[model samples]
Target: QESPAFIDPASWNTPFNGIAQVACHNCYEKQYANTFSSVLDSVRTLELDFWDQRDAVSGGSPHHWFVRHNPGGNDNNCTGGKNDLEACLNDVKNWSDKHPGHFPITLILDKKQGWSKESSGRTPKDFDELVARVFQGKLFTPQDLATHIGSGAGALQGNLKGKSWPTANDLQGKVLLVLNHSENQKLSQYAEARTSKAKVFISPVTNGQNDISGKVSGMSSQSSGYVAMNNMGKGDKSWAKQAFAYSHIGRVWGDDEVSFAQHINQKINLSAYYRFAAQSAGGYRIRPF
Candidate 1:
Protein backbone atom coordinates (compact mmCIF):
# COMPACT_ATOMS: atom_id res chain seq x y z
CA GLN A 1 0.00 0.00 0.00
CA GLU A 2 1.16 3.50 -0.81
CA SER A 3 2.15 5.30 2.39
CA PRO A 4 0.27 8.52 3.11
CA ALA A 5 3.55 10.19 3.95
CA PHE A 6 3.56 13.74 2.67
CA ILE A 7 6.34 14.15 0.10
CA ASP A 8 5.67 17.81 -0.54
CA PRO A 9 8.48 19.89 0.96
CA ALA A 10 6.18 22.10 2.97
CA SER A 11 4.63 19.06 4.61
CA TRP A 12 7.87 18.60 6.49
CA ASN A 13 10.88 18.66 4.20
CA THR A 14 11.75 22.28 4.76
CA PRO A 15 14.43 23.86 2.60
CA PHE A 16 16.38 24.29 5.83
CA ASN A 17 15.78 20.71 7.14
CA GLY A 18 16.45 19.42 3.56
CA ILE A 19 14.63 17.12 1.12
CA ALA A 20 13.91 13.39 1.27
CA GLN A 21 16.61 10.88 0.44
CA VAL A 22 15.11 8.54 -2.15
CA ALA A 23 16.62 6.18 -4.71
CA CYS A 24 15.52 6.86 -8.25
CA HIS A 25 16.62 4.97 -11.39
CA ASN A 26 20.01 4.25 -9.81
CA CYS A 27 21.19 5.76 -6.53
CA TYR A 28 19.57 7.84 -3.84
CA GLU A 29 20.55 11.15 -2.34
CA LYS A 30 18.42 13.60 -0.29
CA GLN A 31 16.13 13.84 -3.31
CA TYR A 32 18.41 16.40 -4.96
CA ALA A 33 17.95 14.95 -8.45
CA ASN A 34 14.24 14.52 -7.95
CA THR A 35 13.96 18.04 -6.56
CA PHE A 36 16.08 19.49 -9.34
CA SER A 37 14.21 17.53 -11.98
CA SER A 38 10.92 18.67 -10.49
CA VAL A 39 12.15 22.25 -10.44
CA LEU A 40 13.15 22.14 -14.10
CA ASP A 41 9.87 20.48 -14.99
CA SER A 42 8.03 23.19 -13.06
CA VAL A 43 10.03 25.90 -14.77
CA ARG A 44 9.15 24.56 -18.20
CA THR A 45 5.52 24.14 -17.22
CA LEU A 46 5.34 27.64 -15.79
CA GLU A 47 6.97 29.15 -18.85
CA LEU A 48 4.52 27.38 -21.15
CA ASP A 49 1.56 28.22 -18.94
CA PHE A 50 2.61 31.81 -18.64
CA TRP A 51 2.74 32.05 -22.39
CA ASP A 52 -0.59 30.34 -22.84
CA GLN A 53 -2.32 32.30 -20.10
CA ARG A 54 -0.93 35.56 -21.36
CA ASP A 55 -2.01 34.73 -24.86
CA ALA A 56 -5.45 33.69 -23.73
CA VAL A 57 -6.06 36.73 -21.56
CA SER A 58 -4.25 39.50 -23.44
CA GLY A 59 -3.91 37.70 -26.79
CA GLY A 60 -0.29 38.72 -27.28
CA SER A 61 3.26 37.73 -26.50
CA PRO A 62 3.53 39.16 -23.01
CA HIS A 63 6.62 37.06 -22.38
CA HIS A 64 8.90 39.50 -24.14
CA TRP A 65 10.64 40.20 -20.85
CA PHE A 66 11.86 36.62 -20.86
CA VAL A 67 12.82 36.79 -24.54
CA ARG A 68 16.30 38.16 -25.04
CA HIS A 69 16.78 40.53 -27.97
CA ASN A 70 19.94 41.32 -29.93
CA PRO A 71 20.35 44.07 -32.51
CA GLY A 72 23.71 42.47 -33.33
CA GLY A 73 21.77 39.22 -34.08
CA ASN A 74 24.88 37.18 -33.17
CA ASP A 75 24.38 37.97 -29.50
CA ASN A 76 20.75 36.89 -29.59
CA ASN A 77 20.18 34.17 -26.97
CA CYS A 78 17.02 32.98 -25.24
CA THR A 79 18.26 32.69 -21.62
CA GLY A 80 19.12 36.26 -20.77
CA GLY A 81 22.57 37.08 -22.27
CA LYS A 82 26.16 35.81 -22.19
CA ASN A 83 26.56 37.95 -19.11
CA ASP A 84 23.59 36.21 -17.56
CA LEU A 85 24.97 32.79 -18.49
CA GLU A 86 28.32 33.81 -17.10
CA ALA A 87 26.57 34.98 -13.95
CA CYS A 88 25.06 31.51 -13.63
CA LEU A 89 28.45 29.95 -14.28
CA ASN A 90 29.91 32.21 -11.65
CA ASP A 91 27.20 31.22 -9.21
CA VAL A 92 27.99 27.55 -9.74
CA LYS A 93 31.70 28.26 -9.48
CA ASN A 94 31.20 30.19 -6.27
CA TRP A 95 29.23 27.33 -4.76
CA SER A 96 31.87 24.80 -5.77
CA ASP A 97 34.61 27.15 -4.70
CA LYS A 98 33.14 27.74 -1.25
CA HIS A 99 32.45 24.06 -0.76
CA PRO A 100 35.49 22.38 -2.26
CA GLY A 101 34.52 19.28 -0.30
CA HIS A 102 31.38 18.88 -2.49
CA PHE A 103 32.19 20.20 -5.95
CA PRO A 104 31.18 18.65 -9.26
CA ILE A 105 32.76 18.97 -12.71
CA THR A 106 34.14 22.19 -14.14
CA LEU A 107 32.09 24.42 -16.45
CA ILE A 108 32.59 24.90 -20.21
CA LEU A 109 31.28 27.26 -22.88
CA ASP A 110 31.17 26.59 -26.63
CA LYS A 111 30.11 29.20 -29.18
CA LYS A 112 31.14 28.35 -32.73
CA GLN A 113 29.94 29.22 -36.22
CA GLY A 114 29.68 25.70 -37.65
CA TRP A 115 29.89 22.01 -36.68
CA SER A 116 33.42 22.23 -35.42
CA LYS A 117 35.16 21.64 -32.10
CA GLU A 118 36.51 25.08 -32.82
CA SER A 119 35.62 27.68 -30.14
CA SER A 120 34.10 29.95 -32.80
CA GLY A 121 32.31 27.15 -34.65
CA ARG A 122 28.52 27.37 -34.37
CA THR A 123 26.34 24.31 -35.04
CA PRO A 124 23.88 21.93 -33.43
CA LYS A 125 26.62 19.59 -32.26
CA ASP A 126 28.59 22.35 -30.58
CA PHE A 127 25.48 23.76 -28.95
CA ASP A 128 24.44 20.30 -27.78
CA GLU A 129 27.94 19.54 -26.54
CA LEU A 130 28.07 22.75 -24.56
CA VAL A 131 24.59 22.46 -23.07
CA ALA A 132 24.77 18.71 -22.53
CA ARG A 133 28.05 18.98 -20.66
CA VAL A 134 26.27 19.42 -17.33
CA PHE A 135 23.91 16.52 -18.03
CA GLN A 136 26.93 14.35 -18.60
CA GLY A 137 28.90 16.05 -15.83
CA LYS A 138 29.82 14.15 -12.68
CA LEU A 139 28.39 16.63 -10.19
CA PHE A 140 25.92 14.24 -8.59
CA THR A 141 25.80 10.86 -10.29
CA PRO A 142 23.09 8.31 -9.44
CA GLN A 143 25.71 6.23 -7.70
CA ASP A 144 26.98 9.21 -5.76
CA LEU A 145 23.52 10.00 -4.36
CA ALA A 146 22.64 6.38 -3.53
CA THR A 147 25.57 6.27 -1.14
CA HIS A 148 24.70 9.34 0.92
CA ILE A 149 23.16 8.04 4.16
CA GLY A 150 23.56 11.26 6.02
CA SER A 151 26.75 12.17 7.97
CA GLY A 152 28.38 12.06 4.48
CA ALA A 153 29.32 8.37 4.84
CA GLY A 154 28.53 7.75 1.15
CA ALA A 155 30.93 10.39 -0.09
CA LEU A 156 33.47 7.67 -0.88
CA GLN A 157 33.10 3.87 -0.92
CA GLY A 158 33.03 1.31 1.88
CA ASN A 159 31.16 -1.88 2.52
CA LEU A 160 28.74 -1.69 5.49
CA LYS A 161 26.24 -4.45 4.71
CA GLY A 162 24.89 -4.56 8.27
CA LYS A 163 23.96 -0.88 8.29
CA SER A 164 20.28 -0.04 8.62
CA TRP A 165 18.46 2.35 6.29
CA PRO A 166 15.02 3.86 6.57
CA THR A 167 12.55 2.73 3.94
CA ALA A 168 9.20 4.28 3.03
CA ASN A 169 7.58 0.96 3.87
CA ASP A 170 8.81 1.26 7.44
CA LEU A 171 6.33 4.10 7.87
CA GLN A 172 3.27 2.18 6.72
CA GLY A 173 0.70 2.62 9.50
CA LYS A 174 0.83 6.37 10.16
CA VAL A 175 -1.68 9.18 10.05
CA LEU A 176 -0.71 12.82 9.61
CA LEU A 177 -3.45 15.07 11.02
CA VAL A 178 -3.32 18.47 9.30
CA LEU A 179 -5.32 21.57 10.28
CA ASN A 180 -5.73 24.57 8.00
CA HIS A 181 -6.46 28.32 8.68
CA SER A 182 -5.46 29.33 12.17
CA GLU A 183 -5.44 27.82 15.68
CA ASN A 184 -9.08 27.04 15.05
CA GLN A 185 -9.15 23.33 15.87
CA LYS A 186 -7.25 21.30 18.42
CA LEU A 187 -8.64 17.82 17.90
CA SER A 188 -5.60 15.85 18.95
CA GLN A 189 -7.50 14.10 21.80
CA TYR A 190 -10.10 12.89 19.32
CA ALA A 191 -7.57 12.03 16.56
CA GLU A 192 -5.53 9.93 18.99
CA ALA A 193 -8.31 7.31 19.01
CA ARG A 194 -6.97 5.89 15.73
CA THR A 195 -4.62 2.91 15.72
CA SER A 196 -1.76 5.07 14.56
CA LYS A 197 -2.44 8.76 14.81
CA ALA A 198 -0.36 11.97 14.76
CA LYS A 199 -1.52 15.55 14.67
CA VAL A 200 -0.43 18.86 13.08
CA PHE A 201 -2.03 22.27 13.46
CA ILE A 202 -1.52 25.61 11.68
CA SER A 203 -1.93 29.22 12.81
CA PRO A 204 -2.78 32.46 11.04
CA VAL A 205 -0.23 34.92 9.72
CA THR A 206 0.61 38.40 10.97
CA ASN A 207 -0.18 41.79 9.27
CA GLY A 208 -3.81 40.65 9.07
CA GLN A 209 -3.62 39.22 5.57
CA ASN A 210 -5.00 36.07 3.93
CA ASP A 211 -1.58 35.18 2.63
CA ILE A 212 1.04 33.74 4.92
CA SER A 213 2.95 36.76 6.17
CA GLY A 214 4.34 38.36 2.97
CA LYS A 215 4.30 35.28 0.74
CA VAL A 216 3.05 35.59 -2.83
CA SER A 217 0.98 33.24 -4.97
CA GLY A 218 2.73 30.19 -6.41
CA MET A 219 6.49 29.46 -6.13
CA SER A 220 7.49 26.79 -3.62
CA SER A 221 8.10 28.18 -0.14
CA GLN A 222 7.76 27.34 3.55
CA SER A 223 4.78 28.67 5.49
CA SER A 224 5.15 30.66 8.67
CA GLY A 225 1.84 29.19 9.78
CA TYR A 226 2.06 26.37 12.28
CA VAL A 227 2.13 22.80 10.88
CA ALA A 228 3.12 19.41 12.17
CA MET A 229 4.24 16.26 10.34
CA ASN A 230 3.84 13.30 12.63
CA ASN A 231 4.36 9.58 12.19
CA MET A 232 3.21 6.65 14.34
CA GLY A 233 6.12 4.86 15.89
CA LYS A 234 6.32 1.85 18.18
CA GLY A 235 8.00 1.47 21.57
CA ASP A 236 8.99 3.96 24.24
CA LYS A 237 11.04 6.37 22.12
CA SER A 238 8.54 6.21 19.27
CA TRP A 239 7.53 9.80 19.81
CA ALA A 240 11.14 10.82 19.43
CA LYS A 241 11.46 8.78 16.26
CA GLN A 242 8.25 10.14 14.77
CA ALA A 243 8.81 12.69 12.01
CA PHE A 244 7.16 16.04 12.77
CA ALA A 245 7.14 18.70 10.09
CA TYR A 246 5.36 21.85 8.88
CA SER A 247 4.77 23.70 5.61
CA HIS A 248 3.55 26.88 3.93
CA ILE A 249 2.41 25.20 0.71
CA GLY A 250 -0.56 23.53 2.43
CA ARG A 251 -1.68 26.73 4.16
CA VAL A 252 -3.58 28.03 1.12
CA TRP A 253 -5.96 27.02 -1.67
CA GLY A 254 -3.61 25.82 -4.37
CA ASP A 255 -5.73 23.35 -6.32
CA ASP A 256 -8.22 23.85 -9.15
CA GLU A 257 -11.39 21.73 -8.92
CA VAL A 258 -12.62 22.01 -12.52
CA SER A 259 -9.32 20.65 -13.81
CA PHE A 260 -9.51 17.88 -11.22
CA ALA A 261 -13.07 16.87 -12.12
CA GLN A 262 -12.06 16.67 -15.77
CA HIS A 263 -9.10 14.44 -14.96
CA ILE A 264 -11.34 12.08 -12.96
CA ASN A 265 -13.66 11.70 -15.94
CA GLN A 266 -10.91 11.22 -18.54
CA LYS A 267 -9.02 8.28 -17.05
CA ILE A 268 -8.17 7.16 -20.58
CA ASN A 269 -6.96 9.40 -23.39
CA LEU A 270 -3.90 10.95 -21.79
CA SER A 271 -4.09 13.85 -24.18
CA ALA A 272 -7.58 14.69 -22.95
CA TYR A 273 -6.58 14.23 -19.32
CA TYR A 274 -3.57 16.46 -19.76
CA ARG A 275 -5.71 19.03 -21.55
CA PHE A 276 -8.06 19.12 -18.59
CA ALA A 277 -5.27 19.09 -16.01
CA ALA A 278 -3.76 22.08 -17.73
CA GLN A 279 -6.76 24.01 -16.47
CA SER A 280 -5.65 24.08 -12.82
CA ALA A 281 -3.90 22.45 -9.88
CA GLY A 282 -5.81 19.29 -8.84
CA GLY A 283 -5.52 17.67 -5.42
CA TYR A 284 -7.51 17.46 -2.19
CA ARG A 285 -4.60 18.51 -0.01
CA ILE A 286 -3.96 21.64 -1.99
CA ARG A 287 -7.48 22.28 -3.26
CA PRO A 288 -8.55 25.92 -3.42
CA PHE A 289 -10.91 26.60 -0.54
Candidate 2:
Protein backbone atom coordinates (compact mmCIF):
# COMPACT_ATOMS: atom_id res chain seq x y z
CA GLN A 1 0.00 0.00 0.00
CA GLU A 2 1.17 3.57 -0.63
CA SER A 3 2.90 5.09 2.38
CA PRO A 4 0.50 7.09 4.51
CA ALA A 5 0.49 10.69 3.35
CA PHE A 6 3.08 12.42 5.53
CA ILE A 7 0.44 14.97 6.42
CA ASP A 8 -2.71 15.26 4.39
CA PRO A 9 -2.55 18.61 2.61
CA ALA A 10 -6.30 18.43 2.91
CA SER A 11 -5.82 17.96 6.65
CA TRP A 12 -5.06 21.66 6.75
CA ASN A 13 -8.38 22.72 5.26
CA THR A 14 -10.80 21.91 8.11
CA PRO A 15 -13.87 24.09 8.64
CA PHE A 16 -16.46 24.49 11.37
CA ASN A 17 -19.10 26.80 12.72
CA GLY A 18 -18.11 30.02 14.40
CA ILE A 19 -14.50 31.24 14.15
CA ALA A 20 -12.68 29.57 17.00
CA GLN A 21 -9.21 31.02 17.76
CA VAL A 22 -7.04 32.15 20.67
CA ALA A 23 -6.39 35.85 21.27
CA CYS A 24 -2.97 36.89 22.65
CA HIS A 25 -3.09 39.63 25.26
CA ASN A 26 -0.28 42.17 25.50
CA CYS A 27 1.14 40.35 22.55
CA TYR A 28 3.95 42.88 22.16
CA GLU A 29 4.69 43.45 25.81
CA LYS A 30 8.27 42.85 26.95
CA GLN A 31 7.09 39.69 28.65
CA TYR A 32 6.30 38.40 25.16
CA ALA A 33 8.47 40.71 23.12
CA ASN A 34 8.77 39.83 19.45
CA THR A 35 6.57 36.81 20.14
CA PHE A 36 4.43 37.69 17.14
CA SER A 37 7.11 36.55 14.69
CA SER A 38 7.31 33.12 16.29
CA VAL A 39 3.56 32.58 16.69
CA LEU A 40 2.29 34.27 13.53
CA ASP A 41 2.36 30.99 11.68
CA SER A 42 0.15 29.38 14.31
CA VAL A 43 -2.01 31.87 16.20
CA ARG A 44 -4.81 33.76 14.44
CA THR A 45 -5.43 36.69 16.78
CA LEU A 46 -3.20 39.18 18.66
CA GLU A 47 -3.96 41.75 21.33
CA LEU A 48 -1.64 44.77 21.54
CA ASP A 49 -1.52 48.16 23.16
CA PHE A 50 -0.85 51.17 20.89
CA TRP A 51 0.85 54.38 21.91
CA ASP A 52 2.38 57.45 20.30
CA GLN A 53 5.89 58.06 21.60
CA ARG A 54 8.70 60.30 20.43
CA ASP A 55 11.00 58.51 18.02
CA ALA A 56 14.28 57.93 19.77
CA VAL A 57 16.20 57.97 16.51
CA SER A 58 14.69 61.19 15.23
CA GLY A 59 14.42 62.79 18.68
CA GLY A 60 11.47 64.82 17.46
CA SER A 61 8.38 66.30 19.08
CA PRO A 62 5.42 64.59 17.44
CA HIS A 63 5.87 60.96 18.45
CA HIS A 64 6.14 57.89 16.28
CA TRP A 65 3.63 55.19 17.00
CA PHE A 66 4.89 52.13 18.84
CA VAL A 67 3.43 48.89 20.20
CA ARG A 68 4.14 48.64 23.91
CA HIS A 69 2.26 47.87 27.09
CA ASN A 70 3.78 50.83 28.95
CA PRO A 71 5.05 53.57 26.69
CA GLY A 72 5.02 56.01 29.55
CA GLY A 73 7.97 54.63 31.52
CA ASN A 74 10.72 52.01 31.87
CA ASP A 75 10.47 51.22 28.16
CA ASN A 76 10.63 47.38 28.32
CA ASN A 77 9.41 47.29 24.73
CA CYS A 78 10.32 44.88 21.95
CA THR A 79 13.94 43.96 21.30
CA GLY A 80 16.28 45.81 18.87
CA GLY A 81 14.12 48.94 19.12
CA LYS A 82 12.01 47.34 16.39
CA ASN A 83 8.88 47.53 18.49
CA ASP A 84 7.54 50.52 16.60
CA LEU A 85 4.04 50.35 15.21
CA GLU A 86 5.38 50.20 11.66
CA ALA A 87 7.61 47.26 12.60
CA CYS A 88 4.70 45.33 14.04
CA LEU A 89 2.59 45.95 10.94
CA ASN A 90 5.46 44.98 8.68
CA ASP A 91 5.87 41.59 10.34
CA VAL A 92 2.11 40.91 10.27
CA LYS A 93 1.89 41.90 6.61
CA ASN A 94 4.83 39.71 5.69
CA TRP A 95 3.19 36.76 7.41
CA SER A 96 -0.12 37.46 5.71
CA ASP A 97 1.47 37.48 2.29
CA LYS A 98 3.06 34.11 2.94
CA HIS A 99 -0.18 32.50 4.11
CA PRO A 100 -2.42 33.88 1.36
CA GLY A 101 -5.95 32.48 1.81
CA HIS A 102 -4.92 29.84 4.34
CA PHE A 103 -6.50 31.63 7.31
CA PRO A 104 -7.28 35.18 8.32
CA ILE A 105 -5.35 37.11 10.99
CA THR A 106 -6.95 39.49 13.46
CA LEU A 107 -5.52 42.38 15.49
CA ILE A 108 -7.27 43.30 18.68
CA LEU A 109 -5.90 46.67 19.81
CA ASP A 110 -6.16 48.57 23.06
CA LYS A 111 -6.17 52.17 21.88
CA LYS A 112 -4.18 54.14 24.44
CA GLN A 113 -3.17 57.13 22.34
CA GLY A 114 -4.34 58.94 19.25
CA TRP A 115 -2.33 59.56 16.11
CA SER A 116 0.65 61.87 16.64
CA LYS A 117 0.75 65.29 15.02
CA GLU A 118 4.20 66.10 16.36
CA SER A 119 7.42 66.04 14.30
CA SER A 120 6.27 63.94 11.36
CA GLY A 121 3.17 66.19 11.16
CA ARG A 122 1.32 63.06 10.18
CA THR A 123 -2.41 62.83 10.58
CA PRO A 124 -4.75 59.86 10.81
CA LYS A 125 -4.61 59.78 7.03
CA ASP A 126 -0.94 58.97 7.34
CA PHE A 127 -1.82 56.35 9.90
CA ASP A 128 -4.36 54.89 7.51
CA GLU A 129 -1.74 55.02 4.80
CA LEU A 130 0.65 52.96 6.93
CA VAL A 131 -2.08 50.39 7.59
CA ALA A 132 -2.84 50.10 3.89
CA ARG A 133 0.84 49.69 3.20
CA VAL A 134 1.06 46.76 5.61
CA PHE A 135 -2.15 45.09 4.43
CA GLN A 136 -1.09 45.80 0.84
CA GLY A 137 -4.68 46.94 0.15
CA LYS A 138 -7.72 48.39 1.80
CA LEU A 139 -7.97 47.23 5.40
CA PHE A 140 -11.06 45.14 6.15
CA THR A 141 -13.23 47.63 7.98
CA PRO A 142 -16.69 46.83 9.28
CA GLN A 143 -18.05 48.23 6.04
CA ASP A 144 -16.53 45.24 4.22
CA LEU A 145 -17.68 42.78 6.85
CA ALA A 146 -20.24 41.22 4.52
CA THR A 147 -17.71 40.49 1.81
CA HIS A 148 -15.34 38.91 4.34
CA ILE A 149 -18.21 36.76 5.56
CA GLY A 150 -19.05 35.66 2.00
CA SER A 151 -22.42 37.32 2.28
CA GLY A 152 -22.32 38.40 -1.33
CA ALA A 153 -25.74 39.47 -2.44
CA GLY A 154 -28.28 41.58 -0.59
CA ALA A 155 -26.16 41.64 2.55
CA LEU A 156 -27.26 44.69 4.46
CA GLN A 157 -24.71 47.02 6.03
CA GLY A 158 -24.27 47.06 9.82
CA ASN A 159 -25.96 43.66 10.09
CA LEU A 160 -22.98 42.02 11.82
CA LYS A 161 -24.48 42.18 15.27
CA GLY A 162 -25.92 38.87 16.51
CA LYS A 163 -25.22 37.21 13.16
CA SER A 164 -23.52 33.95 12.34
CA TRP A 165 -19.77 34.11 11.71
CA PRO A 166 -18.20 33.21 8.37
CA THR A 167 -16.08 30.16 7.66
CA ALA A 168 -12.34 30.25 6.93
CA ASN A 169 -13.19 29.79 3.26
CA ASP A 170 -15.19 32.97 3.51
CA LEU A 171 -12.37 34.96 5.12
CA GLN A 172 -9.68 33.95 2.59
CA GLY A 173 -6.51 35.71 3.71
CA LYS A 174 -8.24 38.65 5.30
CA VAL A 175 -6.57 41.12 7.67
CA LEU A 176 -9.10 42.13 10.30
CA LEU A 177 -8.15 45.05 12.60
CA VAL A 178 -10.37 45.64 15.61
CA LEU A 179 -10.03 48.44 18.21
CA ASN A 180 -11.02 47.69 21.78
CA HIS A 181 -11.87 50.20 24.51
CA SER A 182 -13.22 50.46 28.01
CA GLU A 183 -16.95 50.22 28.72
CA ASN A 184 -16.97 53.66 30.32
CA GLN A 185 -15.34 55.70 27.54
CA LYS A 186 -15.80 54.91 23.85
CA LEU A 187 -12.86 55.20 21.53
CA SER A 188 -12.11 58.55 19.96
CA GLN A 189 -13.28 59.42 16.46
CA TYR A 190 -9.79 58.80 15.14
CA ALA A 191 -10.26 55.03 15.50
CA GLU A 192 -12.77 52.62 14.05
CA ALA A 193 -15.96 51.85 15.94
CA ARG A 194 -15.13 48.19 16.48
CA THR A 195 -14.40 47.12 20.06
CA SER A 196 -12.94 43.72 20.98
CA LYS A 197 -15.67 43.24 23.57
CA ALA A 198 -18.38 44.19 21.09
CA LYS A 199 -16.98 42.45 18.05
CA VAL A 200 -16.00 39.10 19.60
CA PHE A 201 -18.63 38.25 22.15
CA ILE A 202 -17.78 35.85 24.99
CA SER A 203 -20.18 34.03 27.26
CA PRO A 204 -18.41 33.23 30.54
CA VAL A 205 -19.80 30.39 32.62
CA THR A 206 -18.22 29.73 35.99
CA ASN A 207 -18.54 28.82 39.69
CA GLY A 208 -15.20 27.16 40.22
CA GLN A 209 -15.57 23.50 39.09
CA ASN A 210 -19.35 23.52 39.47
CA ASP A 211 -21.74 23.43 36.53
CA ILE A 212 -23.21 26.71 35.41
CA SER A 213 -25.58 26.58 32.49
CA GLY A 214 -25.47 29.20 29.74
CA LYS A 215 -24.53 32.83 30.33
CA VAL A 216 -23.86 33.76 33.90
CA SER A 217 -26.68 35.85 35.27
CA GLY A 218 -26.31 39.26 37.00
CA MET A 219 -23.26 41.52 36.66
CA SER A 220 -20.86 39.17 34.81
CA SER A 221 -23.24 38.17 31.99
CA GLN A 222 -21.86 38.93 28.58
CA SER A 223 -23.57 41.01 25.92
CA SER A 224 -25.61 39.36 23.21
CA GLY A 225 -23.64 38.39 20.13
CA TYR A 226 -21.61 35.45 18.78
CA VAL A 227 -21.01 33.12 21.73
CA ALA A 228 -17.34 32.37 22.58
CA MET A 229 -17.06 30.21 25.68
CA ASN A 230 -13.95 30.70 27.81
CA ASN A 231 -12.13 27.39 28.22
CA MET A 232 -10.72 28.29 31.64
CA GLY A 233 -14.12 28.77 33.16
CA LYS A 234 -16.17 26.00 34.79
CA GLY A 235 -18.37 25.49 31.74
CA ASP A 236 -15.49 25.18 29.24
CA LYS A 237 -16.17 21.48 28.69
CA SER A 238 -19.96 21.72 28.40
CA TRP A 239 -19.87 25.00 26.54
CA ALA A 240 -17.40 23.64 23.99
CA LYS A 241 -19.65 20.66 23.24
CA GLN A 242 -22.64 22.97 22.82
CA ALA A 243 -20.63 25.48 20.81
CA PHE A 244 -19.16 22.94 18.38
CA ALA A 245 -22.45 21.07 18.20
CA TYR A 246 -24.09 24.34 17.14
CA SER A 247 -21.23 25.06 14.73
CA HIS A 248 -20.27 28.12 16.77
CA ILE A 249 -16.77 29.30 17.61
CA GLY A 250 -15.40 28.57 21.06
CA ARG A 251 -12.79 31.04 22.43
CA VAL A 252 -10.28 30.75 25.29
CA TRP A 253 -8.03 33.08 27.33
CA GLY A 254 -5.13 32.51 29.76
CA ASP A 255 -3.53 34.64 32.46
CA ASP A 256 -0.20 32.92 32.95
CA GLU A 257 2.37 31.97 30.31
CA VAL A 258 2.15 28.25 31.15
CA SER A 259 -1.60 28.14 30.62
CA PHE A 260 -1.21 30.20 27.47
CA ALA A 261 1.26 27.74 26.02
CA GLN A 262 -0.98 24.77 26.77
CA HIS A 263 -4.07 26.38 25.23
CA ILE A 264 -2.17 27.47 22.15
CA ASN A 265 -0.13 24.35 21.34
CA GLN A 266 -2.84 21.90 22.37
CA LYS A 267 -6.42 23.18 22.38
CA ILE A 268 -6.16 25.80 19.65
CA ASN A 269 -3.91 23.80 17.36
CA LEU A 270 -5.96 20.64 17.79
CA SER A 271 -9.15 22.54 17.00
CA ALA A 272 -7.65 24.00 13.85
CA TYR A 273 -6.34 20.64 12.73
CA TYR A 274 -9.73 18.96 13.16
CA ARG A 275 -11.54 21.74 11.35
CA PHE A 276 -9.16 21.76 8.40
CA ALA A 277 -9.07 17.99 8.13
CA ALA A 278 -12.86 17.74 8.15
CA GLN A 279 -13.18 20.48 5.57
CA SER A 280 -10.59 18.82 3.38
CA ALA A 281 -12.45 15.53 3.76
CA GLY A 282 -15.56 17.22 2.29
CA GLY A 283 -17.56 16.61 5.45
CA TYR A 284 -17.23 20.02 7.14
CA ARG A 285 -20.28 22.26 7.10
CA ILE A 286 -20.94 25.68 8.55
CA ARG A 287 -23.47 25.49 11.36
CA PRO A 288 -26.69 27.31 10.42
CA PHE A 289 -27.15 28.69 13.90
Top model by TM-score, which number?
2
Model 2: pairs clashing at backbone N, Cα or C within 3 Å? 13-276, 14-275, 14-276, 15-275, 17-247, 18-249, 62-118, 62-119
Put down candidate 2 lDDT per residue, 218-272, tens digits, no spaces.
2211221222332233224334444444333444333233333333333332122
Q: What is the TM-score (0 to 1) of candidate 1?
A: 0.19
Over 4 Å off in model 2, which ranges?
1-17, 54-63, 73-82, 114-124, 146-158, 183-188, 191-289
Candidate 2 has what TM-score? 0.54
What TM-score, over all chains together, does every model reach?
A: 0.19, 0.54
Model 1 per-residue lDDT tens digits across residues 38-122: 3221111110100111122332221111111221111211122232322333333343344333211212121111122234332
**Which residue segments of model 1 deviate by more than 4 Å?**
1-67, 70-82, 85-119, 137-289
Give the least accurate 10-residue stretch of model 1, judged by summed lDDT.
43-52
Can you give the lDDT of residue 160 in candidate 1?
18
lDDT of each: 0.21, 0.42
